[PDB]
Amino acid sequence: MKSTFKSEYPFEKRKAESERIADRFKNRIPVICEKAEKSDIPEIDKRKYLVPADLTVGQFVYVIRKRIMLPPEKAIFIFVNDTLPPTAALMSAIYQEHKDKDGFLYVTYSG
């Protein structure tokens, strides 16, 4: 049994969120950021992020970093459907290309 975001809320309730957000926030992309299933680094229970269209991967990664007090020495990586996007990539671009049918964009992190 999974302990993810999809597994915690049903499709219909998830999409409900996507829409209210796309409604009450014009320039924001709703992101679900979860820890890589078999990764070792710390797991945060805060996974819902409202990100600006111009936010970059590199910047998003920096955020998750501080959030889980990652030793700058240690590494962390963000994935979008098995794809490791380049740090210059803008989240808006990634959203158009990979948003889930529920309305969210699912990202994953690890080391």
Binding site: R28, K48, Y49
Partner: peptide, 4 residues
């Protein structure tokens, strides 16, 4: 939610 967290606004980044």
């Amino acid at each position: 939610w967290e606004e980044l």
